[PDB]
Amino acid sequence: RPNLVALTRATTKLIYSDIVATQRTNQPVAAFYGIKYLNGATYAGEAGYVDREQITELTEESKLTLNKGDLFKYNNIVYKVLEDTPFATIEESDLELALQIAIVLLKVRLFSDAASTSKFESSDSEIADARFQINKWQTAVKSRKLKTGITVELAQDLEANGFDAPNFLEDLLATEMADEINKDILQSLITVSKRYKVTGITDSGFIDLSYASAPEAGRSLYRMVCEMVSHIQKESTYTATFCVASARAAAILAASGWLKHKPEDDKYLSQNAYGFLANGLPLYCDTNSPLDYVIVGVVENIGEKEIVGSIFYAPYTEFKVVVDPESLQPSIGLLVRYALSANPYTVAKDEKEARIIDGGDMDKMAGRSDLSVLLGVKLPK
Amino acid sequence: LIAFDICGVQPMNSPTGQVFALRAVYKKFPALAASTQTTVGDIYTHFFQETGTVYLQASVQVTIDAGATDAAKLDAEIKKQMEAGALVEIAEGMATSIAELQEGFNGSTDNPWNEMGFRIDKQVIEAKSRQLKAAYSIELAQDLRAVHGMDADAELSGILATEIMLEINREVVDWINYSAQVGKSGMTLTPGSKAGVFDFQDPIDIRGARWAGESFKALLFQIDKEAVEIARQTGRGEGNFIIASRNVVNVLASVDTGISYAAQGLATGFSTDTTKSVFAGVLGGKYRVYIDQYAKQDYFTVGYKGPNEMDAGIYYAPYVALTPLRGSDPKNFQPVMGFKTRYGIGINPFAILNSLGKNAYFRRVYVKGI
Amino acid sequence: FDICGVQPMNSPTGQVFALRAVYKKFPALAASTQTTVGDIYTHFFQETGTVYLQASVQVTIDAGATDAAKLDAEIKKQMEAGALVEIAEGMATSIAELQEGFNGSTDNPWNEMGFRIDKQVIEAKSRQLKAAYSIELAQDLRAVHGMDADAELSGILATEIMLEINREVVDWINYSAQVGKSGMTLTPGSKAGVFDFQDPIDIRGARWAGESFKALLFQIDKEAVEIARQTGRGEGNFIIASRNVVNVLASVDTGISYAAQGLATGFSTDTTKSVFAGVLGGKYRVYIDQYAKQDYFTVGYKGPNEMDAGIYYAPYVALTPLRGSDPKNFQPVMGFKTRYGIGINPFAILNSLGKNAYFRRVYVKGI
Amino acid sequence: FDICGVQPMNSPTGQVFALRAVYKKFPALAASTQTTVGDIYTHFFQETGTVYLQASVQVTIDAGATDAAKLDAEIKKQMEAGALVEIAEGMATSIAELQEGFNGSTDNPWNEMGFRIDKQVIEAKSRQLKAAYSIELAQDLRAVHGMDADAELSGILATEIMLEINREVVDWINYSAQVGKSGMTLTPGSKAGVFDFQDPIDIRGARWAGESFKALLFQIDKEAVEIARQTGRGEGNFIIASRNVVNVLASVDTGISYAAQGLATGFSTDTTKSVFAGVLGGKYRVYIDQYAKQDYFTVGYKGPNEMDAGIYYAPYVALTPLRGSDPKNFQPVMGFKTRYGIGINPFAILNSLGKNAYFRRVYVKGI
């Protein structure tokens, strides 16, 4: 449908198509695909895991029974012991930190299980299992529709404006549609994004830059946002690729030197971006939601496929415009439909659960992205 | 695929609008008594204390007990003479014989220029309309194309056209069954029957049948009786067709099966084209039979149709058919499509006031026990 | 499967379409009233209740029939006398027409083309089978008789997986089918859902198996009608039944249900035991449920339109072969997989059981 | 011969192949339960056991029926009403399918195909006959009738060895055949393995030959069904039966067996009774067991592939003449020798007696 395709081209250009992953459908439902792993380091092979089980959990009472040449693992990372009694000289009570110290002081050594070809082939050793699984799910294509191209005396007005009006009105209608769609995307993204939480929520409470807290510069938020990106790096094999925030949350609040107003409009920045941050990421802005929040997360691809995302979008065409003369009024109806969903496997142990849930059911997917986080922000209204 | 081969058509080129129909214009026996010396061939009437009266023709020249002064005694003697075959009972046959004799005897040239018993007249009918709404959606129209390469509206149209034609054919049947007289009654009633209903489990209706086969044939025979009554009242002819419920049609179809097409070509080719808009076949080589796909209960109507379009008892005179309508509903922009016709109906006058339960061209019977 | 809407789903999920349907005040018959020929009058009998009687005769109904019991007697006498006849719902048709004719008006009385027409998303449900054979067997099948060995196994195997699929389709038909010989299809003395050849009611008084077997086919026609009625699509077009039932039904209507008699004649030149045998009554294509659990038949409807089947089978990925080898014993691996998916006219699996008007299932006893 | 596989020898031992096959708590119905259409409940009646009942009608089963006797009465009433319908395994399947589909999975459910296919080694077992005739016979057959003496004896001799071999194969079939009219093919009032024409149950109420004989065919079809089920390959294709049984069957279906009318017409011109009588019901190629011991029939299956017989005849040598003279009385020697041996689907010779799924043998009484 070339006329709808032309409207598609002229309408999807108006939404934040890159803050979600984009896939497409041709079905009444969209088959979506995505990638997930539940714990990141070294090999994921059975041989690896078994050797790890067979050496030690590095408990506090056992860390000193280790000597030169021994292996140990902690938090699934295998380390070799350099010289005797590693940690003998480390008073640190938090074993994880003691380990970090031991690595630096060369008491232990990050250990690689890489080996000769012969070792592997001779023993008929096991092999790395997959880190990530590839999931598939489907959701219904959902829609919205408008009766907004009002005509009658309006036709007369449009005739007066007849030099532009035919196309102008369809483009305008498409624009308001795009606006609600963009907002719909944001609602889903907002919902799925995990609540960023550190020590009882972002330093033991949601960041608060209110008058009674820290009406500073907005620096403390910029710092927190940058940390949100760190969180993404910690939990997933990706760096943040986008950020969206309200004006009061960051689009304006961080404009104290840690936000750039699109100095350049064509390099590493979409046409729909409000700007970008000093810590990168094209920056988007919602402007609608009562939340006044910040979202940090990642969209990523393998070749042409946007397989990674918290939310996936899959439009379905064969942007329909219909002209109907109710009585005296040949108004223009506009219909747009698409699938939009979160990866349901983030709320499932396996397919038996995935098969009874819906990635489009945002009452379940709420807070379960893992490819995005949200910062609640209290502000100096 | 419109039925209507069982009606006059006489199509309109204007509503109001008219059709023609060949509307039909439409004994003092000596008593038998004690001491009566009958004479062979003579006909005597006798009122019995029980079960009314009889008309008996003498086969024997016998005196009926001159001592039978007691009506009870007289009835007994007459009964004995009847048992003897001396006196034989016929009812209308006797009335006719004496009436014809009386006319012959007192016949006169005079001026007995009677009329051919057909008035022949016409009715004015409006091109009464019927119409359907496709009531479909954009989303299916789009998905149908997108998913299977289907033509959407074109297919909806095919359904719609079929449905309006079926609904029209249905209406025709409702009119037939509105106006039809109820059969298995009167001249076609079995004394032990249930008044207008044929019950396949009832020994009377099934004529002493054994198992379903013979019970099914008994219905066939009730149909022939209905066909006769139609001829008797119409003055035009024996029922020529049957409209009946699927249950009835299957029953008839099971008997002398060559009468109907099982549509074995349809079954063989795995539902090539069900064509569920036509007549099944011809029962007994006499009645073209059609399935009422919307039968309300379970029934059969026998009807007459002469070769002349003016001899149906019911008329359909199409002026407009399948006019496609297209549109949309602006309240939500869903597409709109539909079909409209204008055809009108006619009914032999029989004087819809003079139609309900009065139409001599059709006899309807309710069926139980299938 | 050849009675299903194929709607082949070139992608799983995936859906099929179905043409799902959208889904007496006669003044009085009473003492002293006078009926008029052709009209209809309402009456409630003290026993048997409401009837509707139509006049053949213009007559005063006993003006002295004060007592309802007396009136009931008079009304019955008028029926006995041929003055009155009885029709029930058929009179409803007449009142509706009387009212509609009388009040007909152009207005906006558009009727709907009373079909919902809808779509149902389905998964391409999979199925898989292994060849499970040794190399030595394959070597000998070729070496000894010139057989194509594993290719022959592939043929058998592929046939077998397809048979299992067809089995599944039938099992779901018998799940979704409504219980037949019920409601509209009952004889008052019948046993509801089961046709028992030893029961004189079910066999309608049949004398010996010949007549009884015909009686079974008659119940089948009754089922075909109920399907026709509820779906609004017409008489059932096919029958699926157990080996016992098929043999019984194939005893009537000559060899119309085919045993592929030419194969028998030629000493099993084939057996072709995978498809519909033929056409019972000249009306219903009949297939054999080769896995029937008890003894039964199901009557169903199939239109020419793939959306008018009531059941859908959409063979995405059919008979795709697998190949491999297992070095532990260095034996061959061969097998087949499919991803077909199924579905029905929604009629709202939970909304399928005992609900689908396109099919009616009856249990058979006494064979 | 034409009802078995052949797979000829090239040497004894020697082998054949065979297509050997590999080989849920419906909720209780109780007082007050509102059944819902399509749903199925379990109900054990105090008398005559449990059935599952499917609802056709949504209905509450007498909440006051706390007395199991009362509950049975209400349930029976609802069944009479057509509200509830009894089915046994059709139901067990329906629930099993629901449970597996609904709570099913993906995983890797590779089943093996139902067929294993296997092989056997067979020696070319020998058989032979001698004419055992004298010179004086030969001299006079020529001198008196102009006959070719031993030439005729040879024709007889060859015929007898042929018949004897076919007889042996049949004996092995009857040996290995399972006994029919058993298990899955029993009439509840039946006599276990024997069809008795004088028994109204077996003959389905039949009177005289017409109906009684058709009733035997009815049992034959049931036997064909059991074969189909157990072999996994399809209904029986042929019948071996005694002369009495064959004549009984021949009397029905009009043209199934040939009377060889030309033979009778011409006064026994050429009997040729070494072939199949014809095809029973158009379904089973039928042949007379000329050596039947009691009175009986065996129904058997044969596919187009020689390995799909259940029994295999593998000729190596046939009609090798034997010739000579015996000096003790100097009488001529004539004879024939053959070598073949047979195979039998393994079914696991001791694994054949009464175990062969391709055949069902029934003893017949009352003819």
Swiss-Prot record, chain A:
Cleaved signal peptide residues: none
Keyword check for Mitochondrion: no
Domain of life: Viruses
InterPro entries in the record: CAPSP (IPR038999), Gp23/Gp24_T4-like (IPR010762)
Post-translational modification: Proteolytic cleavage at the N-terminus by the prohead core protein protease gives rise to the mature capsid vertex protein.
Keywords, alphabetical: Capsid protein, Late protein, Virion
SS bond partners: none
GO cellular component, one term: viral capsid
Family designation: Belongs to the Tevenvirinae capsid vertex family.
HAMAP family the record matches: CAPSID_P_T4
Subunit and interaction comment: Homopentamer. Interacts with the portal protein. Interacts with the major capsid protein that forms 160 hexamers.
Task of the protein: Capsid protein that self-associates to form pentons, building the capsid in association with hexamers of the major capsid protein and one dodecamer of the portal protein. The capsid vertex protein self-associates to form 11 pentons, building the T=13 laevo capsid in association with 160 hexamers of the major capsid protein.
Stated name of the protein: Capsid vertex protein
Native species: Enterobacteria phage T4
Lineage: Viruses, Duplodnaviria, Heunggongvirae, Uroviricota, Caudoviricetes
Encoding gene per record: 24
Swiss-Prot record, chain B:
GO CC annotations on file: T=13 icosahedral viral capsid; viral capsid
SS bond list: none
Keywords: Capsid protein, Late protein, T=13 icosahedral capsid protein, Virion
PTM comment, free text: A proteolytic cleavage by the prohead core protein protease gives rise to the mature major capsid protein during virus maturation.
Keyword Cell cycle: no
Recorded superkingdom: Viruses
Keyword Membrane (UniProt): no
Function: Major capsid protein that self-associates to form hexamers, building most of the capsid in association with pentons made of the capsid vertex protein and one dodecamer of the portal protein. The major capsid protein self-associates to form 160 hexamers, building most of the T=13 laevo capsid. Folding of major capsid protein requires the assistance of two chaperones, the host chaperone groL acting with the phage encoded gp23-specific chaperone, gp31. The capsid also contains two nonessential outer capsid proteins, Hoc and Soc, which decorate the capsid surface.
Similarity comment: family membership: Belongs to the Tevenvirinae major capsid protein family.
Record text on subunit structure and interactions: Homohexamer. Interacts with the portal protein. Interacts with the capsid vertex protein that forms pentamers. Interacts with hoc; one hoc molecule associates with each capsid hexamer. Interacts with soc; this interaction reinforces the capsid structure. A total of 960 subunits of the major capsid protein forms the 160 hexamers.
Protein name (Swiss-Prot/TrEMBL): Major capsid protein
Record organism: Enterobacteria phage T4
Shown chain mapped onto the complete sequence: 106 to 521 of 521
